[PDB]
């Protein structure tokens, strides 16, 4: 028994509709300033951004903005260096348990594939992040819990992380809770499928090529099968 | 193989060259009538079963929900 | 056109040459045309 998030009119919902890359950039900013404290985008590395919403040198900037340790040194373990374009996003709580502790038993789930891993993810995400409503009568959430009608059980350890104007969008687009939830849902989506755009272009070329090739192959088949389909049989007993 | 497949007699068989005949003779001219002829010939033997399927499907889903529904008298 | 059959379709070799050459250029045209479409459909959303 769970609330089933509704269908939202996403800009990538259509059959050939790509992602809005400004929204992916804003959602990456939302993840960097809010979501990165507990969740780990393990499978997304700074380099990945180049080509989507940040240019090579631009990405380098972001990369240079983090300290990543280099374990093997002549005699030492870690002089975290300026993270590079080859470095993956920095996971908070190096060990899972660490977070468990920090989040009161909860383990923020790595949001790299969250949208893909959650049924109706994009919607779910938006709903969960925006579904922090009032608990009803009779409910008795355990210590360190909050109430979201969507989350399985309606008892997500995650406290509501998006308060209106939680962070300021560099683009200046008003940082309303929603504008922030929609941006981070687009970004997480991108994260779970960096190739969304490239694919849809392949699908458009595939539809054009099949629309060219199916009637022509049908015409060749009907040529080579007309002979028989016109064959007239006659029985002429002597 | 061919030549030893079967024995027929006095069955003449005329035919035409592919390039000599129209590719889609009366394609939609008779195709539609025929497709329609065909469906009415098996529709009564194909659809009926699946119709009932849609029905069981629906009834099943609704019934389940009702089961989940809280019993009014429950707790009251 | 009966020039086609005589120049392109008639000899298998010629029938081929035309296919290969056409295909060589078709890609250029198809990709270009297709890209124009894709982009426009989502003109607003793309890096640039």
């Amino acid at each position: 028994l769970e609330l089933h998030p509704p269908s939202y009119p996403w800009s990538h919902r259509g059959l050939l509709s790509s992602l809005d890359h400004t929204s992916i950039r804003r959602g990456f900013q939302v993840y960097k300033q809010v979501c990165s404290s507990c969740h780990s985008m393990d499978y997304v590395a700074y380099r990945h951004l180049v080509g989507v919403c940040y240019t090579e040198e631009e990405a380098k900037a972001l990369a240079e903005e983090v300290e990543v340790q280099d374990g093997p040194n002549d005699d030492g373990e870690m002089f975290m260096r300026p993270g590079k374009l080859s470095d993956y996003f920095p996971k908070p709580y190096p060990n899972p348990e660490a977070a468990r502790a920090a989040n009161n038993g909860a383990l923020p789930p790595d949001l790299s594939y969250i949208v893909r891993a959650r049924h109706g993810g994009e919607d779910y995400v938006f709903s969960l992040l925006t579904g922090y409503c009032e608990p009803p009568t009779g409910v008795s959430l355990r210590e360190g819990l909050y109430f979201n009608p969507y989350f399985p059980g309606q008892a997500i350890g995650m406290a509501p992380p998006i308060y209106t104007e939680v962070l300021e969008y560099d683009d200046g687009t008003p940082a309303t809770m929603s504008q922030v939830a929609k941006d981070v849902a687009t970004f997480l989506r991108w994260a779970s499928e960096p190739e969304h755009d490239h694919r849809k272009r392949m699908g458009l070329k595939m539809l054009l090529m099949m629309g060219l090739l199916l009637p022509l192959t049908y015409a060749m088949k009907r040529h080579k099968w007309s002979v028989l389909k016109s064959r007239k049989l006659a029985y002429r007993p002597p | 193989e061919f030549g030893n497949l079967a024995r027929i007699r006095h069955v003449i068989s005329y035919s035409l060259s592919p390039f000599e005949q129209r590719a889609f003779p009366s394609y939609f001219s008779k195709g539609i009538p025929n497709v329609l002829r065909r469906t009415r010939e098996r529709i009564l033997r194909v659809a009926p079963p699946f119709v009932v399927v849609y029905l069981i499907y629906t009834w099943g889903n609704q019934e389940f929900e009702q089961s989940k529904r809280k019993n009014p008298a429950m707790y009251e | 056109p009966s020039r086609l059959y005589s120049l392109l379709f008639r000899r298998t070799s010629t029938f081929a040459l035309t296919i290969a050459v056409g295909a060589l250029f078709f890609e250029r045209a198809f990709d270009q045309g297709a890209d124009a479409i894709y982009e426009h459909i989502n003109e607003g959303k793309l890096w640039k």
Binding site: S226, S230, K232, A234 | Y14, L16, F19, E20, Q21, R22, P25, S26 | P1, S2, Y5, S6
Partner: peptide
């Protein structure tokens, strides 16, 4: 014999100098 009947009509099939094009 073999001349009693003539090749059946294929007019609804047959198309309407042209071979080269065809």
């Amino acid at each position: 014999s073999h001349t009693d009947v003539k090749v059946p009509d294929f007019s609804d099939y047959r198309r309407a100098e042209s071979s080269e094009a065809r």
